[PDB]
Structure formats: structure tokens, C-alpha cells
Curated annotation (Swiss-Prot), chains A, D:
In BRCA1-deficient cells, function of the shieldin complex is necessary for sensitivity to the PARP inhibitor olaparib. Residues 1-36 are annotated as: Sufficient for interaction with MAD2L2. The chain holds residues 38 to 73 of 250 of the full protein. It is found in: Chromosome. This is Shieldin complex subunit 3. Component of the shieldin complex, which plays an important role in repair of DNA double-stranded breaks (DSBs). During G1 and S phase of the cell cycle, the complex functions downstream of TP53BP1 to promote non-homologous end joining (NHEJ) and suppress DNA end resection. Mediates various NHEJ-dependent processes including immunoglobulin class-switch recombination, and fusion of unprotected telomeres. Component of the shieldin complex, consisting of SHLD1, SHLD2, SHLD3 and MAD2L2/REV7. Within the complex, SHLD2 forms a scaffold which interacts with a SHLD3-MAD2L2 subcomplex via its N-terminus, and with SHLD1 via its C-terminus. Interacts with ASTE1.
From Swiss-Prot, chain B:
GO terms for cellular component: chromatin; chromosome; cytoplasm; nucleoplasm; nucleus; site of double-strand break; spindle; zeta DNA polymerase complex. This is Mitotic spindle assembly checkpoint protein MAD2B. Its main location: nucleus. Residues 14-148 are annotated as: Mediates interaction with REV1 and REV3L and homodimerization. One of its GO terms (molecular function) is RNA polymerase II-specific DNA-binding transcription factor binding.
Length: 36, 200, 201, 36
């Protein structure tokens, strides 16, 4: 299989500067109990 | 007569939001406890109910939308990073926008959503064709543009307090990955293909 | 768990559906742009016009941080005529009570059902409002608890989507008749919707 | 009926600077034919 746009180190992509949130097991259980 | 670049951007942004949420669910990037079943593209899917995560994904895609509208995007990639922040798996959405001419009048968008439904179905069952990720993974999103990003760095900063940066090579490169194709589609307004990059 | 953000997410999603439905029911734009969708288990009419959809989305995206911080008194959909005079206003008054005894028994499910009652009422509100000539455009007004000039930085969330202080002409109707549509109380949100209509002879 | 927040001319609200689009009956016909 060959992609349309194979890896090319000569042109870097953009990414968000901030990382996604880290969700502890404790916080996940609160979402489960309250928000679902 | 109509802004079909904006149509394609809208369709892709809604689809990528569903697809990102589902990837996080089926690859267990976040605990199952935060997800709730929904229906998108007539498929039973899973959406996070964690507010800060939902806003992060929203902000990310609102920023990509103007670039989609002007057809400046080659790839949108969901990168799964291991506990050492090294890429272990990538979901690669390759996109092109064909000549927007003599499009079909026969429920164009319903046809397109049907084609997109098949991508959601393939993501839904991909756990059985991929190796399980190690514990402790996180994710990021990479946007590959058709040209080097000076124009693009200006145009992507849509959302207050949500800056973007050029990625570093180690955010991107996996050494000789296995490529697993999931789905390809073509239409009058969008061609797209989804494959996974996996450690070999 | 930031319930201020939960309330803001729920309200922005609801207000977006409500704006679309108001435009359809009050014939602000041609019927041909609308398509029936399901929201809150209820059949709603939503615009398929991309620029209109983006305007509405961007507007409510900007309101969200003000909602999260409980700085909004009302959100108003103002229907305007060709001379940009208010024809009719749909006023959503909002308060967020102390978030303390918040229920664990499917809170968001109960809230969505209370919000569904607003959508359903809007869908039939032609039956309780006067039948004056329709407007041809609209705006959204955000009334804040604090002076509006000091929320300018907070509201400008989207590049190239600036906000301004409204003109009195955008806001003022002469002795309007107030038509209540729906009121709701919950542990996380109180809201009431009424319409300002032109006065009678 | 009494609103919670009666009209107060001394506290103007904010509004978007941009205007929503103009949508002719013919533009709406194109929306209907292609996007519904």
C-alpha cells in the first residue's frame, strides 16, 4: 500500500502547542457518574 | 453560486470530530468511563463527555476549518504517543478536493455522509486488526499543508489562547511503520483515504 | 469538575438549535435553506446555508466563556426589518444558581428534557405570537452582569469575528408586548424565554 | 408578566460586528437542491 502523501521530512506539519488534558481515573469516574 | 469549499470544510470538521472521539475510545487513549454512546452517520459511536477534552478537540478543528475551506490541507493525523511521548500509532486522513464542477444534484450531501459512514464503521472495528497500544498513551493532532506554513501559521490561529507550532521531527517520524489501510472514498467534492501507521 | 463549563456547553448547543428554529418559524429566511434534524429527541429545522451556519456557530462560540464564568444575564435573538429596526425579540434570560447540591441522578438527561420543552414551544410559537410582517435579518445581543465594555476581551474568541457595543436602535422596542414562552428551573440553570412583540394600537 | 432583567438603557449589550448573510430565494433554491 502506498499513500497519496508519503512522509516528507522537508515539510513539517503544524500541531497545537498545548497538549490534550490528562484525565485521571478519579476524574473519569466523576464524568461517568455526573455527565453521562 | 455556493461556497462548496465551506461545505467541504463543514462536512470534514463534523466528521473529524466524531472520528477523533471514536479513535480515542477504540484505542483506549482515555478511560471508557468518559464516553457516552451516540449516533452519527447512523452508526452507534462513542463521544467523550469530559468538558475540557471536548473543548480541546473543538478548538483544534475550528482552527483547521479555514485551511480546509481554502483546500490547503494534505493530511490530518491523529498521533498516539506512548508514555515517553514517542509516536506509536497514527490515524492518517489524506484529503484532496477535486474540481468543483458539474457536481451531482442527487442528494450530494446524503451520498457523501453515506461514504463517510463507512470510515466510522472501519474505525469502530479496527481494534481487531491492530496491535494493542501499550499503557499510558496520549494523543496529538498534526496538520500537513500543501505548502510550507507561513500563510498557514497565520491562518490556523483561529481561536483565542489556542496557539499552534511547527511540529518537531520526532513528533512525526516512525521508523519503517506498517501501513494498514482502512477506507478510501471519492466524490464530486472530496476524495479521502484513511490508513493507520503501526510499529512493525 | 467544572460545572460552569458544563452549563456553558449545554447552553451554547441549545442556543444554536434555538436560533436556527426561530429563523425558520418566523420566516426570516427562505424555507428552502432548512432541513429537518433531530435535536433533544425533537424534530428541528436547521439551516443548510454554510455562511449562515458559521455566523451562528461563531456567535455562540464567543458567548461560551462568558456563560462559563456566569457573566451573562440574557441572550437575545433580535429579528430586524430592512431598515434594521427590531421587529421582534426572543429573549433568553439566564441565571446559574450556586452549584452545590448538584444531582447525581442523570442531571444532563433531566436538563436536556427541560431544554427540549423550549425547542418544542418555539416550534409552535406562531400560534401564540402576532402575525406581523417578517423581518429579513437578525442579530444576537449579549447582556452581561458587568459592564459590556469590560467583557470585550473575553468575548472575542474567534479571529476576525469582532464584537461591539450595540446601538440603542438595535435594542429598543416601544412599549412591547411581552409573551412568555417557557420557564425552567434546575440545580445548574434557571432560564426563561419570552418574546418582545410590537405594541398594539 | 415580569422579566428578570427589564430593559435598562444605561447598560447596552454586546453584539457581533459582522452581519449574517443575505440569502436570496434563488440562493436558497441552490441550497435546497444541493445541500438538503
Amino acid at each position: 500500500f502506498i499513500p497519496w502523501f508519503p512522509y516528507d521530512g522537508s515539510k513539517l506539519p503544524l500541531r497545537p502547542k498545548r497538549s490534550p488534558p490528562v484525565i485521571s481515573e478519579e476524574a473519569a469516574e466523576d464524568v461517568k457518574q455526573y455527565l453521562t | 453560486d455556493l461556497n462548496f469549499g465551506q461545505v467541504v470544510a463543514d462536512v470534514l470538521c463534523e466528521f473529524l470530530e466524531v472520528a477523533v472521539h471514536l479513535i480515542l475510545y477504540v484505542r483506549e487513549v482515555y478511560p471508557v468511563g468518559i464516553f457516552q454512546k451516540r449516533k452519527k452517520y447512523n452508526v452507534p459511536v462513542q463521544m467523550s463527555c469530559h468538558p475540557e477534552l471536548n473543548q480541546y478537540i473543538q478548538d483544534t478543528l475550528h482552527c483547521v476549518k479555514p485551511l480546509l475551506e481554502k483546500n490547503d490541507v494534505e493530511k490530518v493525523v491523529v498521533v498516539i504517543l506512548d508514555k515517553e511521548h514517542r509516536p506509536v500509532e497514527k490515524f492518517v486522513f489524506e484529503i484532496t478536493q477535486p474540481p468543483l464542477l458539474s457536481i451531482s444534484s442527487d442528494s450530494l450531501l446524503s451520498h457523501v455522509e453515506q461514504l463517510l459512514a463507512a470510515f466510522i464503521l472501519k474505525i469502530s472495528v479496527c481494534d481487531a486488526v491492530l496491535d494493542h497500544n501499550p499503557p499510558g498513551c496520549t494523543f496529538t493532532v498534526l496538520v500537513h499543508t500543501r505548502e510550507a506554513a507561513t500563510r498557514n501559521m497565520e491562518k490556523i490561529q483561529v481561536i483565542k489562547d489556542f496557539p499552534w507550532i511547527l511540529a518537531d521531527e520526532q513528533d512525526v517520524h516512525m521508523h519503517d511503520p506498517r501501513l494498514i489501510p482502512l477506507k478510501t472514498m471519492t466524490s464530486d467534492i472530496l476524495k479521502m483515504q484513511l490508513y493507520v501507521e503501526e510499529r512493525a
